[PDB]
Amino acid sequence: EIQIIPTHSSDEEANLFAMQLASAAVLPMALKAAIELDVLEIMAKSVPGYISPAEIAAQLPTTNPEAPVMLDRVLRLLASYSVVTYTLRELPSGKVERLYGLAPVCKFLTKNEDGVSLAPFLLLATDKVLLEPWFYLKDAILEGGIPFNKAYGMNIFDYHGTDHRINKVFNKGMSSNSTITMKKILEMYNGFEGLTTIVDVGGGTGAVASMIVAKYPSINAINFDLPHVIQDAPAFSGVEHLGGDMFDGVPKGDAIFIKWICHDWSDEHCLKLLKNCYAALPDHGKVIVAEYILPPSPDPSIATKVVIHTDALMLAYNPGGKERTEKEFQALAMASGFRGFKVASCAFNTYVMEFLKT
Amino acid sequence: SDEEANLFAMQLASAAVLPMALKAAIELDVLEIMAKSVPPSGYISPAEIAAQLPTTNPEAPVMLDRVLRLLASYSVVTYTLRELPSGKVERLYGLAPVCKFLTKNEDGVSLAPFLLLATDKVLLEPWFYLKDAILEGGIPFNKAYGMNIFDYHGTDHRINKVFNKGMSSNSTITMKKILEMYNGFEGLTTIVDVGGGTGAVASMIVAKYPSINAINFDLPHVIQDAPAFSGVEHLGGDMFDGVPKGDAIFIKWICHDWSDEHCLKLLKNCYAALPDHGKVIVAEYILPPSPDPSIATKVVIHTDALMLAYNPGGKERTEKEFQALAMASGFRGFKVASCAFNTYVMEFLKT
Ligand SMILES: Nc1ncnc2c1ncn2[C@@H]1O[C@H](CSCC[C@H](N)C(=O)O)[C@@H](O)[C@H]1O
Ligand SMILES: Nc1ncnc2c1ncn2[C@@H]1O[C@H](CSCC[C@H](N)C(=O)O)[C@@H](O)[C@H]1O
Ligand SMILES: C/C=C/c1ccc(O)c(OC)c1
């Protein structure tokens, strides 16, 4: 370990890092506006890279003379963070102009073959509704409670039942994200083959249930979630949509699949749901749990960052939620009656574990 | 490589967690507690931090740990791991170099109040109207509130104070460094700080050059909050109507708030306010020539994006753009005199 001697040079880097931190929110917020204006889809479709901000603006419903320069300024920020790429063209007239192209991350920020990306997940994570709890984080640490419940007087799921705009944003966000992950899950994970019935507990609007039934047409699926979510679930052949509250019970099936459910809830709420799962399954049933697994240390890798970001988000938003290690998941499994524990697969940082009653 | 792209997109989507988590740590005084309490070897437990917070919440240590873990992953704090007898590891946290600027120094100053400003609820709101401003014209801030940001500051006194202390702390740190390097204040008898805020810069210059009489010129609602400093006279006004007379005019972070037309109008009042051989001293970021990934470029491009969402047309400019503003406003001479923390000090010379 070599010691860095403090100098004006190292003080400058520390100062500018603090300044970068101060205004770090400009990145997701600028990206959110690019996605809502459909700037990246325009780039994806119009690119002969690289396109000028004036050529992008020409495809927007605007007569604002300042649109191209406003777009230029946004895209320059995105370029510095490698969300887009750029080239420079000298204007026959002396000044330097930037043209922009899509960077490799835009594969997941623009619709793929099959009409899906992570952009709706980004719109959800940057929604007004979800920024507000952050201003009550201090209060929840000092006064107890949940910053989101302090913001609006109820938990986030009850709030989705009262704000139909955010309910749609959230359901579309989760569906897009699970679609992308499940497609890769389905390629490498064999645990669904052979089952007659599967229940998706907190399955949202049913994207995962419907993909499993598409791959395995002899499976019958039940998409189980809250009534305000189920009311908006598209019909899909092989999928039964059922509204309820999982803490009160879950539908019977041969296996139960829970994706991104455990991390929303405290260990006690988890134990309760997992007992409910244990009771709805036959003697050799299994719970298939798809979640992130906390890494060993808070290292600076992007994969670790994504898991620690989501842990922090389940501090603001949710009733006791947190990310967990592989030992903590096995602990919860053994404590709710399952004798078998297997880490089965991994896609995009999401691990598939089986809790086996066996 | 597909995996890495997907994970980067997920990182971007929840990127705001970092500055929001940091804001909460600063509002809880967690970094100051660390700075005062961290023992010689240099790491402290969240339980030990929490014991110093005004709280009886049994969950506080755990929730602190989880916020600090996020901060550590980004090297805002350092950490060590301590194995527990029963296999699981505990995290202890310490100060990283950035903490120097996010905690009070010996002059009692840090950048923390600038971070409180940048992350304030008031300033997040305009971002939801950026799409609207791009399609329809206008300024996201104006769309959200009734009016321009500075008028808003004269209506919402909490934000007025946060903004003034934000700017004050930031300008203090930068001005101390500039004053160690820049000799342009000698032979001056009077200096005018136009949009000088609560007067921190004006006071630093008189502290260094007690021969100078400084006018600190800003909007009435900011002057209202300006503490008395000897040798500084506070004066409320509107710079686009006219600037007080002095031997030199100092404008820090003013040009980037305003469109070219507004800057030209300001600089011509400046020219008019000066004697024959006076000068305007302009302290601004300079836009680099490409969107490079360096922290120093990011800071300037972030501020350019912030100007877009808050201000009556501000932006960041290149040195040749500043030379054009100087020229179009009648200045004959231009020089780049020094630089501290990305802030360049330019003079626009009348002869
Ligand atoms: N008490 C409850 N009973 C049933 N579903 C619930 C619930 N509380 C929350 N949920 C559902 O749990 C889901 C958490 S979001 C995860 C959604 C989906 N499994 C996916 O991975 O994409 C939401 O759809 C929410 O409505
Ligand atoms: N018309 C006007 N006349 C004078 N001051 C103005 C103005 N419009 C905005 N301002 C002021 O311009 C300042 C911009 S903020 C940064 C300025 C300060 N020189 C610093 O570097 O810390 C604010 O204090 C704001 O109140
Ligand atoms: C924008 C934050 C992401 C997110 C927030 C709350 C949740 O409950 C969730 O899924 C369980 C995901």
Side-chain angles (χ1 to χ4, degrees):
Chain A
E1 202 142 74
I2 193 168
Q3 262 285 304
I4 284 81
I5 309 297
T7 58
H8 294 314
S9 183
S10 71
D11 276 0
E12 214 106 22
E13 68 193 26
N15 178 294
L16 299 176
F17 184 39
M19 293 302 282
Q20 185 193 14
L21 296 166
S23 49
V26 176
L27 205 208
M29 281 333 109
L31 184 49
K32 186 206 184 169
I35 291 156
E36 310 178 320
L37 278 160
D38 74 290
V39 170
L40 311 179
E41 298 284 3
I42 297 172
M43 299 173 66
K45 261 168 143 199
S46 309
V47 123
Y50 298 90
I51 185 158
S52 63
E55 308 168 306
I56 295 168
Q59 303 168 67
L60 290 172
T62 185
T63 59
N64 177 7
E66 263 49 281
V69 298
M70 300 176 79
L71 290 175
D72 194 17
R73 299 170 60 187
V74 171
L75 286 56
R76 168 173 58 209
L77 170 62
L78 289 184
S80 72
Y81 279 101
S82 314
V83 179
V84 302
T85 60
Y86 75 88
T87 348
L88 303 171
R89 242 220 224 122
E90 292 170 342
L91 281 183
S93 67
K95 262 295 181 60
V96 169
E97 150 180 82
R98 282 151 301 287
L99 318 185
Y100 293 98
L102 294 187
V105 67
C106 293
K107 183 167 166 304
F108 291 102
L109 296 180
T110 52
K111 285 147 105 68
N112 68 9
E113 267 227 40
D114 269 9
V116 172
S117 72
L118 295 175
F121 183 86
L122 186 158
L123 302 179
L124 187 227
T126 58
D127 196 77
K128 206 194 139 272
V129 168
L130 298 179
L131 279 153
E132 267 297 281
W134 290 98
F135 301 108
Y136 289 89
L137 180 52
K138 163 174 139 94
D139 289 325
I141 293 173
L142 296 180
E143 298 319 314
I146 291 42
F148 184 98
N149 293 231
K150 296 183 186 320
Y152 346 41
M154 72 194 73
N155 76 47
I156 179 172
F157 307 114
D158 296 342
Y159 187 78
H160 291 170
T162 85
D163 181 330
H164 307 86
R165 189 193 59 79
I166 190 43
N167 181 49
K168 202 170 74 87
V169 166
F170 181 100
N171 290 154
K172 184 182 190 159
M174 288 297 128
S175 160
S176 295
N177 177 67
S178 291
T179 296
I180 294 316
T181 296
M182 260 321 283
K183 181 188 167 172
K184 185 175 165 221
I185 288 324
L186 259 18
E187 270 130 37
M188 304 165 318
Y189 175 62
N190 287 316
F192 292 120
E193 54 173 68
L195 304 154
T196 308
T197 319
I198 177 135
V199 342
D200 193 3
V201 173
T205 50
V208 168
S210 83
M211 284 172 225
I212 284 154
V213 170
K215 218 252 221 291
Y216 294 103
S218 91
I219 208 151
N220 299 264
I222 289 160
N223 182 234
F224 184 74
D225 207 292
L226 294 168
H228 64 86
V229 177
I230 287 321
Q231 160 63 72
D232 296 3
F236 196 92
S237 195
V239 173
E240 193 182 77
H241 295 307
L242 227 68
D245 172 331
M246 60 194 50
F247 294 109
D248 287 346
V250 308
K252 297 175 96 65
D254 297 275
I256 287 165
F257 183 67
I258 38 174
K259 179 184 174 336
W260 279 34
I261 298 304
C262 292
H263 79 165
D264 291 348
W265 296 107
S266 61
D267 290 346
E268 304 183 57
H269 279 267
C270 280
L271 157 97
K272 180 157 177 77
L273 185 278
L274 293 171
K275 296 175 161 192
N276 287 356
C277 290
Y278 188 92
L281 297 156
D283 315 333
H284 315 318
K286 62 177 170 196
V287 185
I288 306 158
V289 188
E291 293 255 285
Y292 292 160
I293 290 176
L294 225 45
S297 67
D299 63 272
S301 79
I302 297 303
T304 293
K305 282 157 171 163
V306 169
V307 64
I308 298 179
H309 279 199
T310 78
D311 188 76
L313 299 164
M314 316 299 348
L315 178 46
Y317 302 149
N318 281 84
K322 52 179 188 215
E323 304 302 337
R324 297 184 167 85
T325 52
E326 200 199 299
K327 283 316 198 272
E328 280 161 298
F329 285 113
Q330 316 193 31
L332 279 175
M334 331 230 109
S336 64
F338 306 90
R339 210 78 109 193
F341 182 94
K342 202 201 179 222
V343 165
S345 315
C346 188
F348 302 127
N349 233 16
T350 286
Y351 278 90
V352 179
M353 297 172 279
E354 301 195 289
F355 290 12
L356 306 153
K357 53 193 274 188
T358 97
Chain B
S1 83
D2 256 13
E3 186 104 352
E4 313 150 48
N6 178 291
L7 304 172
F8 181 44
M10 292 304 286
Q11 191 198 14
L12 292 166
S14 51
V17 182
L18 206 208
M20 293 315 138
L22 187 53
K23 181 205 208 199
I26 289 154
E27 296 195 296
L28 280 160
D29 263 302
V30 156
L31 297 189
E32 299 285 5
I33 287 165
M34 277 172 75
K36 287 161 184 173
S37 311
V38 110
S41 73
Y43 301 94
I44 180 168
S45 77
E48 316 169 279
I49 304 284
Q52 292 176 52
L53 303 177
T55 175
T56 186
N57 184 13
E59 229 59 68
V62 155
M63 295 165 75
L64 280 182
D65 192 7
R66 289 170 70 177
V67 172
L68 288 159
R69 180 161 56 196
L70 171 62
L71 295 182
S73 78
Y74 279 97
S75 304
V76 182
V77 295
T78 54
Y79 75 94
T80 339
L81 298 174
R82 181 207 263 163
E83 200 159 25
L84 296 188
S86 292
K88 113 227 69 146
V89 286
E90 180 200 20
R91 287 143 305 287
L92 302 170
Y93 295 99
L95 303 162
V98 65
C99 293
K100 190 213 187 305
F101 291 97
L102 286 177
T103 51
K104 266 133 48 92
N105 58 9
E106 292 274 66
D107 299 359
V109 205
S110 84
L111 291 186
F114 185 84
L115 186 149
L116 298 184
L117 169 190
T119 59
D120 197 76
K121 54 190 149 160
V122 168
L123 294 175
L124 295 174
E125 263 293 283
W127 290 94
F128 304 103
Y129 295 80
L130 178 54
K131 167 218 186 97
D132 298 322
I134 294 177
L135 294 171
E136 306 174 349
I139 305 156
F141 187 96
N142 301 216
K143 282 180 195 299
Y145 303 95
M147 58 196 31
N148 73 70
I149 185 160
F150 303 110
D151 283 340
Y152 191 75
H153 285 173
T155 77
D156 179 340
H157 297 72
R158 184 196 60 83
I159 214 309
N160 180 43
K161 285 204 276 177
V162 160
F163 181 87
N164 297 160
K165 184 188 195 127
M167 290 293 135
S168 182
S169 292
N170 186 45
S171 288
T172 293
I173 299 299
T174 291
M175 282 307 297
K176 179 170 194 283
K177 181 152 191 242
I178 286 156
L179 256 8
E180 299 165 3
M181 282 179 310
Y182 174 60
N183 302 302
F185 293 120
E186 271 231 84
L188 297 188
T189 84
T190 301
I191 173 80
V192 184
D193 200 342
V194 170
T198 45
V201 182
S203 72
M204 296 171 78
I205 292 172
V206 180
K208 210 219 176 76
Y209 297 101
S211 283
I212 302 179
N213 303 327
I215 301 158
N216 178 235
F217 179 71
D218 207 297
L219 296 163
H221 63 84
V222 177
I223 295 297
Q224 205 57 69
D225 297 331
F229 309 99
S230 188
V232 175
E233 177 195 346
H234 294 291
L235 192 44
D238 171 1
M239 66 196 43
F240 303 95
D241 294 335
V243 141
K245 307 292 190 307
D247 289 327
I249 286 157
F250 180 74
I251 40 178
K252 171 163 185 312
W253 279 33
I254 301 306
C255 281
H256 78 156
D257 293 342
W258 297 101
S259 68
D260 293 343
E261 295 65 28
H262 299 343
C263 282
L264 239 32
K265 171 177 275 282
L266 196 211
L267 293 165
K268 286 160 171 168
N269 296 347
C270 281
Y271 185 93
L274 290 161
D276 300 298
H277 293 71
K279 70 184 167 185
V280 178
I281 301 165
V282 176
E284 287 283 356
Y285 295 160
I286 293 182
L287 199 61
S290 68
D292 71 80
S294 77
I295 292 193
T297 295
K298 287 171 161 160
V299 166
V300 185
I301 289 172
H302 279 199
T303 302
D304 186 64
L306 287 182
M307 298 342 330
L308 179 61
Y310 306 150
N311 289 267
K315 57 182 152 163
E316 303 303 331
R317 295 180 172 88
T318 98
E319 183 191 323
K320 307 311 153 73
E321 298 173 300
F322 283 114
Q323 303 173 2
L325 288 180
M327 191 179 281
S329 63
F331 296 89
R332 289 183 130 298
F334 178 97
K335 94 178 259 196
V336 176
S338 38
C339 190
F341 307 121
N342 259 354
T343 292
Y344 284 91
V345 177
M346 289 161 280
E347 300 186 345
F348 291 3
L349 294 184
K350 281 178 63 159
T351 54

